[PDB]
Design an enzyme around this catalytic site. Structure first.
Site, PDB file in Angstrom:
ATOM      1  N   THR A  37       8.558  -8.633  30.298  1.00 14.00           N
ATOM      2  CA  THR A  37       8.982  -9.540  29.188  1.00 14.00           C
ATOM      3  C   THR A  37       9.100  -8.790  27.884  1.00 14.00           C
ATOM      4  OG1 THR A  37       8.089 -11.420  30.294  1.00 14.00           O
ATOM      5  CG2 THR A  37       8.088 -11.685  27.870  1.00 14.00           C
ATOM      6  N   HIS A 191       7.521 -14.772  41.252  1.00 17.29           N
ATOM      7  CA  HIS A 191       6.343 -14.416  40.475  1.00 17.29           C
ATOM      8  C   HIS A 191       5.251 -15.374  40.868  1.00 17.29           C
ATOM      9  CE1 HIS A 191       3.710 -12.980  37.350  1.00 17.29           C
ATOM     10  NE2 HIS A 191       4.504 -13.117  36.341  1.00 17.29           N
ATOM     11  N   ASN A 194      -0.423 -12.965  37.841  1.00 18.12           N
ATOM     12  CA  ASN A 194      -0.806 -12.914  36.454  1.00 18.12           C
ATOM     13  C   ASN A 194      -1.076 -14.249  35.818  1.00 18.12           C
ATOM     14  OD1 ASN A 194      -0.302 -10.085  36.812  1.00 18.12           O
ATOM     15  ND2 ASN A 194       1.752 -10.192  35.976  1.00 18.12           N
ATOM     16  N   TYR A 196       0.300 -17.340  36.047  1.00 24.15           N
ATOM     17  CA  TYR A 196       1.298 -18.342  35.719  1.00 24.15           C
ATOM     18  C   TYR A 196       1.242 -19.468  36.745  1.00 24.15           C
ATOM     19  CZ  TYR A 196       2.415 -15.067  32.120  1.00 24.15           C
ATOM     20  OH  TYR A 196       2.250 -14.272  30.997  1.00 24.15           O
ATOM     21  N   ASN A 251      -4.786 -14.753  31.859  1.00 22.77           N
ATOM     22  CA  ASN A 251      -4.468 -16.170  31.842  1.00 22.77           C
ATOM     23  C   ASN A 251      -5.478 -16.967  32.593  1.00 22.77           C
ATOM     24  OD1 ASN A 251      -2.201 -15.956  30.241  1.00 22.77           O
ATOM     25  ND2 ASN A 251      -0.785 -15.806  31.924  1.00 22.77           N
ATOM     26  N   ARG A 348       4.540  -0.137  31.274  1.00 23.33           N
ATOM     27  CA  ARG A 348       4.490   0.348  29.924  1.00 23.33           C
ATOM     28  C   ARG A 348       5.136   1.687  29.661  1.00 23.33           C
ATOM     29  NH1 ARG A 348      -1.720  -1.381  29.030  1.00 23.33           N
ATOM     30  NH2 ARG A 348      -1.579  -1.073  31.301  1.00 23.33           N
TER      31      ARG A 348
HETATM   32  C1  FMN Z   1       5.145  -5.887  27.584  1.00 27.00           C
HETATM   33  C2  FMN Z   1       4.792  -6.324  28.969  1.00 27.00           C
HETATM   34  C3  FMN Z   1       5.504  -7.374  29.552  1.00 27.00           C
HETATM   35  C4  FMN Z   1       5.200  -7.712  30.885  1.00 27.00           C
HETATM   36  N1  FMN Z   1       5.958  -8.648  31.460  1.00 27.00           N
HETATM   37  C5  FMN Z   1       5.746  -9.012  32.747  1.00 27.00           C
HETATM   38  C6  FMN Z   1       6.612  -9.967  33.429  1.00 27.00           C
HETATM   39  O1  FMN Z   1       7.635 -10.482  32.928  1.00 27.00           O
HETATM   40  N2  FMN Z   1       6.227 -10.314  34.732  1.00 27.00           N
HETATM   41  C7  FMN Z   1       5.260  -9.611  35.451  1.00 27.00           C
HETATM   42  O2  FMN Z   1       5.057  -9.880  36.617  1.00 27.00           O
HETATM   43  N3  FMN Z   1       4.519  -8.690  34.867  1.00 27.00           N
HETATM   44  C8  FMN Z   1       4.685  -8.405  33.531  1.00 27.00           C
HETATM   45  N4  FMN Z   1       3.950  -7.409  32.942  1.00 27.00           N
HETATM   46  C9  FMN Z   1       2.954  -6.662  33.771  1.00 27.00           C
HETATM   47  C10 FMN Z   1       3.556  -5.311  34.260  1.00 27.00           C
HETATM   48  O3  FMN Z   1       4.662  -5.558  35.152  1.00 27.00           O
HETATM   49  C11 FMN Z   1       2.566  -4.381  34.941  1.00 27.00           C
HETATM   50  O4  FMN Z   1       2.040  -4.948  36.170  1.00 27.00           O
HETATM   51  C12 FMN Z   1       1.421  -3.971  34.045  1.00 27.00           C
HETATM   52  O5  FMN Z   1       1.979  -3.569  32.832  1.00 27.00           O
HETATM   53  C13 FMN Z   1       0.641  -2.821  34.667  1.00 27.00           C
HETATM   54  O6  FMN Z   1       1.533  -1.632  34.790  1.00 27.00           O
HETATM   55  P1  FMN Z   1       1.406  -0.502  33.768  1.00 27.00           P
HETATM   56  O7  FMN Z   1       0.037  -0.036  33.675  1.00 27.00           O
HETATM   57  O8  FMN Z   1       2.268   0.567  34.409  1.00 27.00           O
HETATM   58  O9  FMN Z   1       2.112  -0.909  32.563  1.00 27.00           O
HETATM   59  C14 FMN Z   1       4.190  -7.037  31.629  1.00 27.00           C
HETATM   60  C15 FMN Z   1       3.459  -6.007  31.025  1.00 27.00           C
HETATM   61  C16 FMN Z   1       3.719  -5.671  29.709  1.00 27.00           C
HETATM   62  C17 FMN Z   1       2.879  -4.579  29.128  1.00 27.00           C
HETATM   63  O1  HBA Z   2       3.418  -9.891  28.448  1.00 31.24           O
HETATM   64  C1  HBA Z   2       4.121 -10.731  29.048  1.00 31.24           C
HETATM   65  C2  HBA Z   2       3.809 -10.993  30.376  1.00 31.24           C
HETATM   66  C3  HBA Z   2       4.632 -11.858  31.039  1.00 31.24           C
HETATM   67  C4  HBA Z   2       4.476 -12.092  32.376  1.00 31.24           C
HETATM   68  C5  HBA Z   2       3.463 -11.459  33.057  1.00 31.24           C
HETATM   69  O2  HBA Z   2       3.448 -11.629  34.292  1.00 31.24           O
HETATM   70  C6  HBA Z   2       2.600 -10.597  32.405  1.00 31.24           C
HETATM   71  C7  HBA Z   2       2.772 -10.350  31.057  1.00 31.24           C
END
Ligand code: FMN
Ligand code: HBA
Ligand code: FMN
Ligand code: HBA
Lengths: 399, 399
Positions: A37, A191, A194, A196, A251, A348
């Protein structure tokens, strides 16, 4: 600048750079972009950003054969609740997603749409404005302090869904998956992680129902599995993925503290392999690792070490994508991809490094990310992170 | 003779030789004797063998601080069905077990009684003779060919237990656990593995009930958990252990072929940790490994490699005993006991080697076992296997 005391390691000699087939797609390496996101969609309408989104995704699709899972996209207005996240229900939104899918495919990468429904993570006040319910699994358990603050000022109380209204959400999941495939996406990820809505039905903390949707392992899994089955009838199992975060606490989910959590997720994995026998094996299972139980915590913070996701491999026998603080740990990735069916998601650092896959292959340093622009309505912090070349021309030391 | 192309390895530098507390007992090493049926009890009466049993157990209790789990012992006549396995329900049986427990305790080792109930593994014809039912979870699923042959000649058809008769078995489990502790045992292991009655209720193949004892993960676990809870009220949680074989297929259990099997066993492990929070942590969990899915197959035969028991460690946080073809694999044991709460059971080589613990500590060769005397009514193949010293005096090469 580059990340500071990070010693990179070249990973081109590992299975991360061997080809693999996921659904219909023949990926040329196994580093996938997990859903992220970024809150650049336009209000009103939840329209993908008309100025910047195509460039953002074109930049990250630059290494051929990359799998990209989009940001979460709402399946309908009742599924939403954030003004600046995109949807996949209307013609004006799909006009803009088509252009994103064409640009990614002209780069010879792939694109899967993540279908998102917020549940109790939604802002009750935006929803109240638009005439919509504030939904969740139950009505006597709230997300947190300010979410109940929000709701009562807004006079929009948390509602337990009726069976009827669970069916309507299944109806909208199918339509939105039909829309994504008709506009040209390669597949959809459901999804269910996390915290939702589907995860609120999976978790014993958020789901205190006593009907067929609550009360046991099987009933708590029922909504996620009906959604799997409906999308597999609608568009085919090789075009559907499922994301799970067994140990997440973001969440207000239970995490490792619930003793029954592994059995809840082992059941979902076993039902999926059941279907795989009956001919319908999902394209993949996407897991968030205990290495990251809250994505708002800095890498290394909130790591859960009392459990592991490896139990899924004894049960599900198809591809699994694993995500969570793997960019700063190539020594951990080298071990995890000795497994011949494992893909690694990088969240990230794919934000700050458009060219991550080359940097992984060659062991090049990594651009720091700027948390302050993860959710800004700006091109800055979105489309202007440099590739390694541009970063040298800029002097990020080496010039 | 000694086992032939086996290169032994000394294991005294590993955690197998560090002390650990299990229930009330302070074990001096972690090599435990798992339950082993030897069919030397006397008929009529199912009386422990009056001539040979005390010597057998005294020989295997020779290394101080050893944990010994006895052969399975029937909790009542309806639980039985084999003439020469022992029981723990009558005064004449307990007179003989007292002498076994005193001899083991004079050696400064410990003794836990395995409580056994056969279900469909019982001979229906012995039972018919004695006026008893041929019991199982269900009536429309049989164990195999000759077990249904048996039953109909005997005119003793397989019966699905009523709730009433499940309660009576709980009553007898408590009495038999009271009897074992009153005669001096250190604790009891509830046998819920290897296809006997409690495992027939846990498995979806053998349990096609639709009442509260069948039909879901939770209902299928209900009888094993009621038995845990009743014995924990009766004699205390630090005197109760539970044995599970998630991946076993002996006595017609599903094994890894059932996709829901890990979730069935993850649920039982999570309920046990639940109780551990509420103050009642069982002394241990005893697991049979996928390395051995049928104990009648030679070592290396019937190994299931598509799953692992390691998921239990993410859930249960107390001691686990692991058993299955570990005597011929000290390289595997060395890795498994790096875990600081893991004990290793050695079955078949504790049959042929009274002094196994010294042989493990020092890396000495291992006496071959003689399968032909596992179940004979003889002292031969029971109490006459030599220690290493006697084996050298006998010339088992070296003389
Ligand atoms: C800015 C941001 C937005 C994210 N948006 C989503 C999302 O839309 N849906 C989702 O399943 N996970 C979302 N995540 C979780 C990531 O997909 C990921 O599982 C989490 O960042 C751990 O990976 P990383 O350590 O490589 O960043 C988001 C994470 C961040 C930091
Ligand atoms: O940070 C936004 C976000 C959205 C969906 C997720 O699954 C996790 C994080
Ligand atoms: C002769 C024999 C009798 C057994 N009796 C029992 C028993 O009474 N109860 C039980 O739980 N397991 C029983 N088992 C299974 C063993 O405890 C053990 O799990 C199995 O032999 C694997 O260990 P191993 O490879 O070290 O022998 C028996 C095994 C054998 C070979
Ligand atoms: O060989 C006898 C036997 C008895 C009980 C078991 O659990 C396994 C094997």
């Amino acid at each position: 600048s580059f990340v500071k005391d990070f010693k990179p390691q070249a990973l081109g000699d590992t299975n991360l750079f061997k080809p693999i087939k996921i659904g219909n797609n023949e990926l040329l390496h196994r580093a996938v972009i997990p859903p992220l996101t970024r809150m650049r969609a336009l209000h009103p309408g939840n329209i993908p950003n008309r100025d910047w989104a195509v460039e953002y995704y074109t930049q990250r699709a630059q290494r051929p054969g990359t799998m990209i899972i989009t940001e979460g996209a709402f399946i309908s207005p009742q599924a939403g609740g954030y003004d600046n996240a995109p949807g996949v229900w209307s013609e004006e939104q799909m006009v803009e997603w088509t252009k994103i899918f064409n640009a990614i495919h002209e780069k010879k990468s792939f694109v899967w749409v993540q279908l998102w429904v917020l549940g109790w993570a939604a802002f009750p006040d935006n929803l109240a404005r638009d005439g919509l319910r504030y939904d969740s699994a139950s009505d006597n358990v709230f997300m947190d302090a300010e979410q109940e603050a929000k709701a009562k000022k807004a006079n929009n109380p948390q509602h337990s869904l009726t069976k009827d209204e669970i069916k309507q959400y299944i109806k909208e999941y199918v339509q939105a998956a039909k829309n994504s495939i008709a506009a040209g996406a390669d597949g959809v990820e459901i999804h269910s992680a996390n915290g939702y809505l589907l995860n609120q039905f999976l978790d014993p903390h958020s789901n205190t129902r006593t009907d067929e949707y609550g009360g046991s392992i099987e009933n708590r899994a029922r909504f996620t599995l009906e959604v799997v089955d409906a999308l597999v009838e609608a568009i085919g199992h090789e075009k559907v993925g499922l994301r799970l975060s067994p140990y997440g606490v973001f969440n207000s989910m239970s995490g490792g503290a619930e003793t029954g959590i592994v059995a809840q997720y082992a059941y979902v994995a076993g039902e999926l392999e059941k279907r795989a026998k009956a001919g319908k094996r999902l394209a993949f299972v996407h897991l968030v690792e205990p290495r990251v139980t809250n994505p708002f915590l800095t890498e290394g913070e909130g790591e859960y070490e009392g459990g592991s996701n490896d139990f899924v491999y004894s049960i599900w026998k198809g591809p699994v994508i694993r995500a969570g603080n793997f960019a700063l740990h190539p020594e951990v990735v080298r071990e995890e991809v000795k497994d011949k069916r494992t893909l690694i998601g990088y969240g990230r650092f794919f934000i700050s490094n458009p060219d991550l896959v080359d940097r992984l292959e060659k062991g090049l340093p990594l651009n720091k990310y700027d948390r302050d622009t993860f959710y800004q309505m700006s091109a800055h912090g979105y489309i202007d992170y440099p590739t390694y070349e541009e970063a040298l021309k800029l002097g990020w030391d080496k010039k």
